[PDB]
């Protein structure tokens, strides 16, 4: 039964909104202080904390599409969502371009709130 | 620290099950509805183990795990992320090395840790 | 032969809507649950018209000419048809040089309320 | 292979099709295809091929595991349907290494005399 | 442009030179008269496809050719006469031009024209171009 | 090989199919009869040059074609009739073959043949090929 | 201009204090590089310091004039934001007056255009204390 | 398997003896690598030795098992001739129990075919004396 | 420019030729060339060009320092000669950087009515 | 026209000697002090026949066909002539695949003791 | 060691004469029949200074000389070989570095060192 | 006057013969113990002594051509020769190949014999 699946989609959407608005404070509230991240911008390295994503919230016409979302409920305090993210944007040439990414978010419940404890993206920035 | 070497233990049994080509144990370690992102999937999300079966039918290699980080989420779920370096030989026999970024998501159901979803980057 | 001329008409109207960037006429000729395989989708299957709106707004006054080569129409009753054709596009790049691009296209038409609509389409070749 | 009542019929005849191709059975493949079947595929090099004469070369001249991802089905009456899906193929090259390939496929089925047959199909990606 | 019974051969050379001059001047009006309405065409601008009509070349007459210094050179022309009303000429076209801020450039193409006299007037029924 | 007044059009189709079959079988004898001794040719094997005669294609009849499974497919044929004694056909040739240890391969070319009836027999006076 | 680290695995051990000293002078070095401060960098470097780096094209440069070019031209001009991350620092202590740190340096920066780019460089810094102050006698960089 | 050097510019200075010691143990290290002698290489290396090299793909490997693969498979099999040259060695002495050598390593070898090939690698070796014996605590290689 | 009695005549008319090309003087260049002069050069794209009509495009449409290296001269009577040499050209691109180019040149001179003229020339390398 | 046929004869004999690898006949038709620009010389001018002997011995029983396209002959008296032509070579590679190569060639003939000999030649294009 | 810094001195006056674009001094430092191998010569041997003139007509750069080796041959001839690294800026202004392998051949005629031939590799 | 030019050509030819025969002893006699060499096999590094060339004398159908030789006589004890060396050879494919090099030899007279004190080659092995 999808009791909390919508509950996961809610905080996921709030995450997307915090990224879109460039609001780093809301992103800090939704992430564990010791959050780890694999991503193409990490160049294959395991980077910990929000110190790495900060550089993007302080320096950043697009359209985002989420394809094939899968949610794994792991009890009453752990969840994990994986999906394909397709981003349509305009390059410096003003030409339409599209980029695909495969994203995995690991959510943990602490004190009645979902927080990202690990993030894994591949393979487009 | 204590329940971290259990995640490490089932992870080592997982990697060893992959290196020995033991599909029988791998199936036991994976949930039937396990999802996976990996280069072999060509950007698509593959569910189950029917996709991973083909890679068990198919000499000396050496695996080195670097910077393992473990996130504990309660008492029935965890997630381990690490860098996997692999030294091997290519037909002509020259030593080669490949890097991978792996994330395993473990969950305890019926008193047994199992992979529910895993994410790989690189090779 | 008369039944295929209708499909030719609605197809040419579709390509005219894409060429002129008329997204409203495009939405009228497309089913709300339309699926599409296209090079801009990066091998993924996308559903709905929300994915093409981005190309209607941003990408679309440079002269462009479109040519339809060797259409083939399969009639499947009085309410369903399929058309496959080669689409050539002569355009100008940033340097003003004349250029040309080929694209293989498949359109799956379904007559609903006496009005043909695309339920699925498949484009290949260069975008 | 790997992956509400009528959709499973299209899925069934489609799986029978893919297995008829994997085994090299041109007989059952010919029975499941219309004689005027049209095709877009990388083997046709951007051209539109008609009939089954182009596909015979492969059954005659040509360890594989096929996987189907996210099948979508469009029903257009009780005699016309259209299925689109992702086709992953795990195989071995002459070098012996396992390779994987992706191809987006679109099949257009039409019921004629109580039997579904392919009238047109469109594949992109893996040649 | 530079070029290079026999009377008839020369006639074909005449209508061909007028064709090249019409293309160079961007005069689609004269280009239409020398071409059959159902003219067949193979050219690299068609990307391996067969093009019928004059709608396809109109895009190049309108845009590009309507104009920096350009010199054409015809090399090794061969003419096949096939009766009073049919002929075929094949030759090598070399074009010297300038790109952006020249930098003088040169390009080669191999061209075949199939001429047919209809109602006392030579018209192209089909032509073939390579490497352009 | 698969292909695909009107009687005359079909006649051209006949001699053309016989040409393709003669090339496929490596039968230079029959290929010589259907070609004019002074046949003109543009083809990628000539590297942008114009080739006259049948000496040039003989190297391909002797060496290569004298033989793994190969299937030809003719797409979008167009025929221009230019009087009783002249005709021209243009089409797309697609060849399915095998390289070394196939690995089935496919290749496209755009071909133009210029036929001329001399003494009650169609002969090629010139032909043009692209992308092969 | 700032920098982060990953010191949880390194600090655990016998000699926390000296490890912290070497990380301190290392972060002061990287801070002097990020700000183009050639004065502080000169104070933290031995006069006879040797260097291996991609800018040397496989050669062993000695002194500070080779790096002075980059301090004067490239790093002095930087007004764009640059963020440095020190991943997985390992410290080898070799007596009271010598140490050696190795780490992965990840640089987040803005290119010519306004596009964020990331660069990785494996760095080895060899520290030697003379006159009661740690100084670099040799360093080795890989990657660009 | 042999190796040459260029020690005329390095030996001139105050501490000839210790410089010669470090060059000696360095040439013994390279000699153990050229012969695939994992025993001698193990004796000359600290157990907690760290490493940066192109084989590590920008990662910091620790221990000796990563190099053991190359000793067992690649370097044990070598029956072909290999000649190593140590160009421009620079030595930094950091107390009685620590030293650091940097040099250009040029390898003349025979490839798969019988064609002579040359490889360059910039090498930094960090030596620390424990139990009266010099050992590598860290090294850094560039180039292939 | 830069670099036993008759050879200096060929060298003299050759230097006058190269300077006539560098200044863009098509008049003196035409006087020094035979009307039926043939040419191999990279600008001809592997073809053999006849006359001076092909070279006019350059005098009309087109900081250079030319150097001649190792000139060899073959005398074949008192009315025919052939000189071969290396031609280095130091110039500046639109980027402003000094560039250097090499071209091997062969000139075939023939004395007609008491004046040497080029009947044929062959250049390789720099286009 | 008769005077040019002799040059055609000696030129065809030269190409026959190169094709059959007959180095002695090649030395008879070449002046001892012959100069050559050729792609095998890497932009350098080589003198004598010692440089071509290497190609006669080592490189030269695979079927090869040579075609001479558009020859042009300049007569410069009764003892000196020049011929320029395009040379096509159809051959087989290591894989047995038919291949073709173009080459622009210039031959400078000089009649000595009633026998034409090459004093200089210039080849370009692929070797 | 003493007559090595004279070769170094005339070499430094040479390099400085090149950096300042002073053809006048360069001509004095070179024999009129000086031969040269260099990438700008495209593998050919250029004699004299007419070829080097063009490179004097044509902002901050930094030159570093590495591993200079001097061979003394008597009392009127010497030869110095060295590696020349050059840091510069490319139009867009990114710092760049180039390596060169240079060999200068000095000879004392009329009481003055002069280059008779020089050989360069790389940039 | 070319008094010693032929005298330089003699020892140059003897050098070429020592290389062709693989005789490393004769090459040692004709080279100064502290000979320096720039060459493509040195990868831009200045290598000293005959220790580097040894590897080639102990591990090695061709034809060599010398073009445009220039000799610089620098007194009665120093000379310097520069020339272009073109080598025709057969590759592993059995295909004729050709390679160009630009060579500079610096000869010094000591005890009545010419010896190579410096060598510079570019840019083919």
Numbering used by the authors:
A (entry chain E), L (entry chain E): 343 to 402, 409 to 473
B (entry chain F), K (entry chain F): 344 to 401, 408 to 472
C (entry chain B), J (entry chain B): 344 to 403, 407 to 473
D (entry chain D), I (entry chain D): 331 to 333, 344 to 402, 409 to 473
E (entry chain C), F (entry chain C): 331 to 334, 343 to 404, 407 to 472
G (entry chain A), H (entry chain A): 329 to 472
Publication passage describing the model:
Ca2+/calmodulin-dependent protein kinase II (CaMKII) is a Ser/Thr kinase that is particularly important in neuronal signaling and cardiac function. CaMKII has a unique architecture, in which the catalytic domains are linked flexibly to a hub domain, also called the association domain, which forms a dodecameric or tetradecameric assembly. We reported recently that the activation of CaMKII-α by ATP and Ca2+/CaM triggers the exchange of activated subunits between different holoenzyme assemblies. Our data are consistent with the idea that the CaM-binding element induces the hub to transition from a closed-ring form to a ring-opened lock-washer configuration, which can release or capture dimer units.
The first insight came from a crystal structure of a dodecameric human CaMKII-α hub, for which the crystallization construct contained an additional 22 residues from an uncleaved expression tag. The tag contains an N-terminal hexahistidine sequence, followed by a PreScission protease cleavage site (GSSHHHHHHSSGLEVLFQGPHM). To our surprise, we found well-resolved electron density corresponding to the expression tag at two out of the twelve intersubunit interfaces. There was partial density for the tag at four more intersubunit interfaces. The tag binds the hub almost precisely as we had predicted the CaM-binding element would, and it extends the central β-sheet of the hub domain by forming an additional parallel strand. This docking allows the C-terminal end of the tag to connect to the N-terminal end of the first α-helix in the hub domain proper.
